[PDB]
Amino acid sequence: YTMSLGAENSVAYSNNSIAIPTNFTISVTTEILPVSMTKTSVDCTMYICG
Amino acid sequence: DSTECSNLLLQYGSFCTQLNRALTGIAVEQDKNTQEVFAQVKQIYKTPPIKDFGGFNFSQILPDPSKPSKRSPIEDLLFNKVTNGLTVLPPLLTDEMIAQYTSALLAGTITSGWTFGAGPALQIPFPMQMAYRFNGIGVTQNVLYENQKLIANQFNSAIGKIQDSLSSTP
Amino acid sequence: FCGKGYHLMSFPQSAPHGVVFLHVTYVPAHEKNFTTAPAICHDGKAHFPREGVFVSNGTHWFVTQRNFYEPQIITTDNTFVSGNCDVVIGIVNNTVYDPLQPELDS
Numbered sequence A: 001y002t003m004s005l006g007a008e009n010s011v012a013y014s015n016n017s018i019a020i021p022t023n024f025t026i027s028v029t030t031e032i033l034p035v036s037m038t039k040t041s042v043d044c045t046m047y048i049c050g
Numbered sequence B: 001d002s003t004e005c006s007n008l009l010l011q012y013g014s015f016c017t018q019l020n021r022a023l024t025g026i027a028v029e030q031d032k033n034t035q036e037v038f039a040q041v042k043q044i045y046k047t048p049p050i051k052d053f054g055g056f057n058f059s060q061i062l063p064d065p066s067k068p069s070k071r072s073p074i075e076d077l078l079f080n081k082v083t084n085g086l087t088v089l090p091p092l093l094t095d096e097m098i099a100q101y102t103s104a105l106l107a108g109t110i111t112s113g114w115t116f117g118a119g120p121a122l123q124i125p126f127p128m129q130m131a132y133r134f135n136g137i138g139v140t141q142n143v144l145y146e147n148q149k150l151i152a153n154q155f156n157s158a159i160g161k162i163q164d165s166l167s168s169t170p
Numbered sequence C: 001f002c003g004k005g006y007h008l009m010s011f012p013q014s015a016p017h018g019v020v021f022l023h024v025t026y027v028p029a030h031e032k033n034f035t036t037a038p039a040i041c042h043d044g045k046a047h048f049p050r051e052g053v054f055v056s057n058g059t060h061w062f063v064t065q066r067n068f069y070e071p072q073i074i075t076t077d078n079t080f081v082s083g084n085c086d087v088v089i090g091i092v093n094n095t096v097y098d099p100l101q102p103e104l105d106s
């Protein structure tokens, strides 16, 4: 299929109307970031020649 | 297509697999880069049919209905001004969908301010959004409201100068 | 940068070769429509909110903070005066209460 980009939302814009929140949600989200790798050392002489 | 060459190439092992895997990683990285840059909204916002923004003109940045590509005049100018086993994979997002994402971002930032980036899109008049931005840089709202026509004229002139500067500089 | 929404705080958690950030953010919810104006015209003077925004529920005008609906009476304590009513486009007529007015009366 042709992928959808998002749900379509039409914002009710007018020159004298505003939308004010009356409530809130405390949202906790996860962010995973890699920091380090495995520290690998290769003996070049032993790898090539043993 | 030389079979003797491939038979000799098999002596070198999995070099070809490493080259293909590195190129595949680059290829998926490009799609990930486009996804991170442009797909920052999951709601496709549209501007109202009446472009009454208190004198502020966004025609050079909003999509042009007359063009079949549905691009803005600035985006159309930008797209016009950029010109053996090898294959070119197409990007996952076409130029039309990237233009649609930019249109959604423009509609959100015009009709809703910065509210759509932090939650639900809350509508606000654009001369009130501009006043909020003026308060963000430490200028009182009255300065924006009293001089709203001049600021709208300066903004429109600057947007036109941007289009002229892009069209006139190689 | 620190999660989706208005960032409040964050918590670090160790992970194998990595870090996990628990971003605690504030998201607005249950939004409601109001009729808004840039300024209030009173006594030939233009009044602008000090920190909030003018909203109307249909008949009465209030001032509220921008990110949460908390309607309060439009007074001189939460508005400031700049100029007359002839310059601001979209200024509406409403009374502005004075807290000092019952004091000198009594």
Ligand SMILES: *[C@@H]1O[C@H](CO)[C@@H](O[C@@H]2O[C@H](CO)[C@@H](O)[C@H](O)[C@H]2NC(C)=O)[C@H](O)[C@H]1NC(C)=O
Pocket: A010, A011, A012, A013, A019, C031, C032, C033
């Ligand atoms: C604020 O009011 C507008 C219009 O009075 C509402 O927008 C309409 O919402 C309905 C229901 O989703 C749609 O069927 C209409 O097409 C919308 N009209 C327009 C012009 O956008 C809007 O939902 C109201 N906002 C809130 C928070 O209630």
Ligand SMILES: *[C@@H]1O[C@H](CO)[C@@H](O[C@@H]2O[C@H](CO)[C@@H](O)[C@H](O)[C@H]2NC(C)=O)[C@H](O)[C@H]1NC(C)=O
Pocket: A022, A023, A024, C030
């Ligand atoms: C704001 O939203 C919260 C929930 O996000 C509402 O709290 C709920 O209230 C109902 C009825 O009082 C309870 O049955 C629920 O259990 C409550 N939920 C939670 C998580 O406590 C709250 O009432 C809302 N406030 C306003 C003013 O709309």
Ligand SMILES: *[C@@H]1O[C@H](CO)[C@@H](O[C@@H]2O[C@H](CO)[C@@H](O)[C@H](O)[C@H]2NC(C)=O)[C@H](O)[C@H]1NC(C)=O
Pocket: B051, B057, B058, B059, B060
């Ligand atoms: C917004 O800006 C556009 C572009 O500057 C205006 O369109 C111009 O309108 C004048 C007269 O109406 C024409 O002579 C130009 O040729 C138009 N330019 C283009 C590129 O179409 C438009 O009038 C402005 N205002 C509104 C409300 O859209």
Ligand SMILES: *[C@@H]1O[C@H](CO)[C@@H](O[C@@H]2O[C@H](CO)[C@@H](O)[C@H](O)[C@H]2NC(C)=O)[C@H](O)[C@H]1NC(C)=O
Pocket: C057, C058, C059, C060
């Ligand atoms: C808008 O809000 C105001 C205040 O919250 C409402 O005015 C009050 O309405 C109650 C209910 O009838 C009365 O008992 C009070 O005396 C009113 N206050 C004043 C100062 O008159 C008003 O009704 C609301 N309007 C709408 C359309 O909801």
Ligand SMILES: *[C@@H]1O[C@H](CO)[C@@H](O[C@@H]2O[C@H](CO)[C@@H](O)[C@H](O)[C@H]2NC(C)=O)[C@H](O)[C@H]1NC(C)=O
Pocket: C041, C044, C093
């Ligand atoms: C808001 O209030 C002002 C002040 O009372 C009104 O301005 C007056 O309008 C009358 C009738 O048109 C004129 O005779 C006066 O000369 C005006 N005074 C000033 C200082 O301009 C204004 O019309 C009101 N606007 C609304 C929408 O009610």
Ligand SMILES: *[C@@H]1O[C@H](CO)[C@@H](O)[C@H](O)[C@H]1NC(C)=O
Pocket: A015, A016, B054, C089, C090, C091
């Ligand atoms: C909004 O537009 C209407 C015309 O549809 C006009 O009468 C009104 O004064 C405008 N308000 C502002 C604040 O520009």
